[PDB]
Design an enzyme around this catalytic site. Structure first.
Site, PDB file in Angstrom:
ATOM      1  N   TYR A   1       2.081   9.702   3.655  1.00 25.45           N
ATOM      2  CA  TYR A   1       3.350   9.950   4.406  1.00 25.45           C
ATOM      3  C   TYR A   1       4.350   8.800   4.210  1.00 25.45           C
ATOM      4  O   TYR A   1       5.493   8.936   4.675  1.00 25.45           O
ATOM      5  CB  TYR A   1       3.069  10.180   5.896  1.00 25.45           C
ATOM      6  CG  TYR A   1       2.072  11.278   6.187  1.00 25.45           C
ATOM      7  CD1 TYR A   1       2.369  12.611   5.920  1.00 25.45           C
ATOM      8  CD2 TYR A   1       0.816  10.980   6.705  1.00 25.45           C
ATOM      9  CE1 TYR A   1       1.442  13.618   6.166  1.00 25.45           C
ATOM     10  CE2 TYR A   1      -0.119  11.975   6.962  1.00 25.45           C
ATOM     11  CZ  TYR A   1       0.193  13.296   6.689  1.00 25.45           C
ATOM     12  OH  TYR A   1      -0.741  14.254   6.959  1.00 25.45           O
TER      13      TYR A   1
ATOM     14  N   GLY B   1       0.812  -1.243   0.000  1.00 27.13           N
ATOM     15  CA  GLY B   1       0.000   0.000   0.000  1.00 27.13           C
ATOM     16  C   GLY B   1       0.835   1.277   0.000  1.00 27.13           C
ATOM     17  O   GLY B   1       1.989   1.268   0.444  1.00 27.13           O
ATOM     18  N   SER B   2       0.268   2.357  -0.505  1.00 24.98           N
ATOM     19  CA  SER B   2       0.901   3.698  -0.507  1.00 24.98           C
ATOM     20  C   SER B   2      -0.067   4.671   0.147  1.00 24.98           C
ATOM     21  O   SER B   2      -1.281   4.447   0.044  1.00 24.98           O
ATOM     22  CB  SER B   2       1.304   4.122  -1.909  1.00 24.98           C
ATOM     23  OG  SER B   2       0.488   3.494  -2.881  1.00 24.98           O
ATOM     24  N   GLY B   3       0.459   5.653   0.873  1.00 21.54           N
ATOM     25  CA  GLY B   3      -0.343   6.654   1.590  1.00 21.54           C
ATOM     26  C   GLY B   3       0.254   8.042   1.476  1.00 21.54           C
ATOM     27  O   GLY B   3       1.226   8.223   0.691  1.00 21.54           O
TER      28      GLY B   3
ATOM     29  N   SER C   1       5.071   4.561   1.964  1.00 20.09           N
ATOM     30  CA  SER C   1       4.563   3.339   1.292  1.00 20.09           C
ATOM     31  C   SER C   1       5.115   2.098   2.008  1.00 20.09           C
ATOM     32  O   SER C   1       6.198   2.190   2.644  1.00 20.09           O
ATOM     33  CB  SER C   1       4.844   3.342  -0.187  1.00 20.09           C
ATOM     34  OG  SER C   1       6.238   3.495  -0.426  1.00 20.09           O
ATOM     35  N   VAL C   2       4.345   1.014   1.981  1.00 13.18           N
ATOM     36  CA  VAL C   2       4.691  -0.256   2.684  1.00 13.18           C
ATOM     37  C   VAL C   2       4.874  -1.389   1.677  1.00 13.18           C
ATOM     38  O   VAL C   2       4.008  -1.543   0.742  1.00 13.18           O
ATOM     39  CB  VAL C   2       3.603  -0.595   3.701  1.00 13.18           C
ATOM     40  CG1 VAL C   2       3.949  -1.850   4.483  1.00 13.18           C
ATOM     41  CG2 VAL C   2       3.377   0.607   4.611  1.00 13.18           C
TER      42      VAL C   2
ATOM     43  N   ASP D   1      -1.652   2.641  12.766  1.00 12.91           N
ATOM     44  CA  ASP D   1      -2.164   3.829  11.983  1.00 12.91           C
ATOM     45  C   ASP D   1      -1.452   3.842  10.646  1.00 12.91           C
ATOM     46  O   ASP D   1      -0.250   4.141  10.641  1.00 12.91           O
ATOM     47  CB  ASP D   1      -2.041   5.138  12.755  1.00 12.91           C
ATOM     48  CG  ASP D   1      -2.808   6.309  12.113  1.00 12.91           C
ATOM     49  OD1 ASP D   1      -2.941   6.316  10.868  1.00 12.91           O
ATOM     50  OD2 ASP D   1      -3.102   7.244  12.827  1.00 12.91           O
TER      51      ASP D   1
END
Ligand SMILES: Cc1ccc(C(=O)N[C@@H](CCC2CCCCC2)C(N)=O)cc1NC(=O)c1cnn(-c2ccccc2)c1C(F)(F)F
Length: 339
Positions: A32, A28-30, A34-35, A165
């Site tokens: 602040y 996933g990317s957000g 990415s994982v 979070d």
């Protein structure tokens, strides 16, 4: 003995990590960072690796970077995400410009799981018990989550749960009326409002309060819990908020038993204790763990509190290079947990 690093490109992002971590694939990317999922050769377990996005670009980015590392280094509880590793390819403060964070990799979140179908009463008892046990811990250190929602609650196949979070389904759907509207003093129990919204949704398969904006959100909430009485109106300091509340046509409190029909009556009783407007009267995490709904799971000898957390940094206004040096110190001083 600084380890050996290697480089690749993933979804337009460059990743430089130690050889310890193999077979990286995007999760996933957000906003602040990415994982990726990775295999940890030292433990033979799957892990999650987060690469922070432009961690020192501004004062605000630099303080947020410091905050996330300080919070992760603190957490030592079964129902809260924990820090397995933190690294940078940088060899000096001077070169320091990238931060990577490593946690357990979880199997799914509760958004995925409820979207499938609604859950059995026994599964709800165990999931909400684990959430409240985690919250007792973080609340004991005066840490407030403030953004609880089904996508922030991660579970494995054996139903073991961790609060995290990801940092992005609207937040406003789960937000306590006093912090959403700034209309009264607010404490750790903003998070207990969110738990009540989540528990309702796990039981029914439906978002309890799916508002389109802050005004529609308040209208949907007041239809269930009723307009504030004179005793709660006494505690509202904002004249804007009081004028707006008192300008609505009155609504009575509903009987929750007439809304959640055919639920476990002990589940309905606990929802009545969580979904109260008055933040002084709402049940705490520690009180909720002792509620009869959790009789199968409650052990007062295995619901621990946290060590104290120094949040004095939250009141400081510092320059980018200062927040960057503070973050470097916390990377250098990190002690990994037992294997
Ligand atoms: C690597 C990492 C790094 C930092 C964090 C993280 O929670 N940071 C917080 C820390 C402070 C919070 C304070 C209140 C209590 C909770 C902590 C923050 N935003 O500041 C999580 C992961 N791990 C994950 O985020 C992770 C671990 N499995 N999974 C996962 C979840 C569902 C399905 C598959 C994987 C994920 C992800 F969400 F990406 F998908």
């Amino acid at each position: 003995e600084r380890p050996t690093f290697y480089r690749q490109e993933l979804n337009k992002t460059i990743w430089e990590v130690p050889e310890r971590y193999q077979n990286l694939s995007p999760v996933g990317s957000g906003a602040y960072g990415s994982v990726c999922a990775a295999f940890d050769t030292k433990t033979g377990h799957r892990v999650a690796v987060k690469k922070l996005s432009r961690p020192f670009q501004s004062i605000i980015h630099a303080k947020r970077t410091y905050r996330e590392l300080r919070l992760l280094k603190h957490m030592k509880h079964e129902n809260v995400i924990g820090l397995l590793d933190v690294f940078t390819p940088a060899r000096s403060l001077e070169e320091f410009n990238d931060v990577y964070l490593v946690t357990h990799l979880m199997g799914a979140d509760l958004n995925n799981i409820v979207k499938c179908q609604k859950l059995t009463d026994d599964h709800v008892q165990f999931l909400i018990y684990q959430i409240l046990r985690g919250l007792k811990y973080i609340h004991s250190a005066d840490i407030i989550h403030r953004d609880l929602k089904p996508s922030n609650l991660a579970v494995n196949e054996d139903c073991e749960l961790k609060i995290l979070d990801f940092g992005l389904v609207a937040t406003r759907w789960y937000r306590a009326p006093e912090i959403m509207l700034n209309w009264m003093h607010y404490n750790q129990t903003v998070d207990i409002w969110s738990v009540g919204c989540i528990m309702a949704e796990l039981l029914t398969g439906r978002t309890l309060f799916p508002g389109t904006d802050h005004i529609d959100q308040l209208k949907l909430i007041l239809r269930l819990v009723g307009t504030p009485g004179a005793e709660l109106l006494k505690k509202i300091s904002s004249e804007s908020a009081r004028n707006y509340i008192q300008s609505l046509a009155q609504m009575p409190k509903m009987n929750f038993a007439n809304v959640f029909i055919g639920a476990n009556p002990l589940a309905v009783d606990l929802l009545e204790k969580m979904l109260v407007l008055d933040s002084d009267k709402r049940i705490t995490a520690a009180q909720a763990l002792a509620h009869a709904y959790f009789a199968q799971y409650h052990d007062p000898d295995d619901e621990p509190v946290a060590d104290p957390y120094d949040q004095s940094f939250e009141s400081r206004d510092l320059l980018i290079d200062e927040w960057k040096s503070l973050t470097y110190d916390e990377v250098i001083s990190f002690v990994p947990p037992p294997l």
